[PDB]
Amino acid sequence: HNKKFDRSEHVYRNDSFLELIKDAVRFFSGTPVHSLPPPERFQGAGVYALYYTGHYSLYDEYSRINRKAYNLPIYVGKAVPAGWRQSRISDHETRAGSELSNRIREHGRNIAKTSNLDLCDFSCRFVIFEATGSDMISTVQAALIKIYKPLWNTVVDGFGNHTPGAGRFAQAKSDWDVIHPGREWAEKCTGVHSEPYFIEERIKQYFSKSNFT
Template sequence: MNNHIANISDKIIDELCNQVIDYFDKSPFFELSNIPPFQGAGIYALYIKPSSKTLYKDVLPAMYPIYIGKAVPAGSRQGVKSGVTKGSPLRARLTKHLSSIEQANNLDASDFLCRFIVLEGKSSDFISAFESIFIKKYNTLWNSHIDGFGINAPGSGRYNQSPSEWDTLHPGRYYASQLTGSPRDLRQIMQKIVNYKPK
C-alpha cells in the first residue's frame, strides 16, 4: 500500500503555509462596514474590537480572529484555468457577513474589523486548503465551535430545520425567524463559549 502514499515533505508544505500566514498577519485591518472596493478571491478573517461590549469580550484575546473564510474564483470547482479572478467574490462575501451582523439584534457592525489577502494565478487553486489551515491555526470560535454564521438562507421547502447556533445566539436574520424546527438550547451554546480556548 505504500506506493499509494504521496511522499510530499511536510517541510515544503510548512514553508509555503508560513509564507501565506506571514503575509496575512501583516495585512491591514479595515472596518467591516467600510471595506474599500477591490477585486479578486482569497482568504479573510473577522475580528471584534477589544473595546466592544459583546458577550465575547472576556473570551477572545485582543485582535484575535473570531471567523475565517474564503471566496474562490468562479468556476474553480469545475477546473477552470487559474488566472486573475474576475469580479469581487471576496468583497461580496465580506459584504454578506456584514449584512448578517447588521441584522442581528445584539451585535453592532461598528465593532467588527476584517483583514484579507487576494490570491491570484496558481495560488488561487489553494484557497480552500489555506482556509482550512488558518482555521486549524486559530481554532476560530465561529468556525469550529459555534455553527451557522456563514450559512445561506434555506431553499424552498427547507424551512423545517432548526435555527443555527449562531442564529440562536444572535437572532435577527430575516430567514431564521421563519424556521420551524426545534429551537436550540441556548445554555449549551453559551457553555461552548465559556469553555472556548484560543490556540
C-alpha cells in the same frame, strides 16, 4: 487495478508545500486590518478573517485579547473564484469578479441585522489569491482555522450559512442564529434548535478551557 496493492505507493509528502503554506499564513497575519466592510470594493478571490473588539457580554474577552492588536479572529471564511464548471470557450470575455469583497460585505450585513452585535465593533483582514495560486484558498482557510480555532467556525456555528431556502425550511436554525437573531430566513426554520443555555456554556468553555495544542 491489474496491479498489486501497496499503501506506500500512494503516500505524498512535500515539506516544501508545508513551508509555502506557512508563508501564506504569516503573510495573512501582517496584512492591513480594516473596518467591516472595507472602505472600498475590490476584485479578487481569497480568504478573510473577522475580529471583535466590542463588549457584548459573552464575547467581552475579545475586547481584552484584541485591545492592542488584532490577535484572535472570531471567524475565518473564504470566497473561491467563479472558476466553475468549465468548458474554456465562448463563453465570451467579461473578466474579474469581486467574490472576496462581496462575501465580506455580505457578512457585514448579517451582523448589521442582529440586535446584539454592532458592526462598528468588527474589523477584518483578507488576502487575495490570484490565478493558479487560487487553488490554495481553502487550505489557507483551513490552516488559519487550525491555528486560531475561531469561535464561529468551531463552537457557535451557522454564521457561514446563506439562506437555506424554500427546499430546506425543515432544518433547525443554527446556534449562531439562536443567540444572534434575526436574519429573517432563520425565523422560517422549523427544526429543533439548541437552547441558548447550552450555547452560552459552550462559549464560556471556549474561553476558560485551554485550547493550546
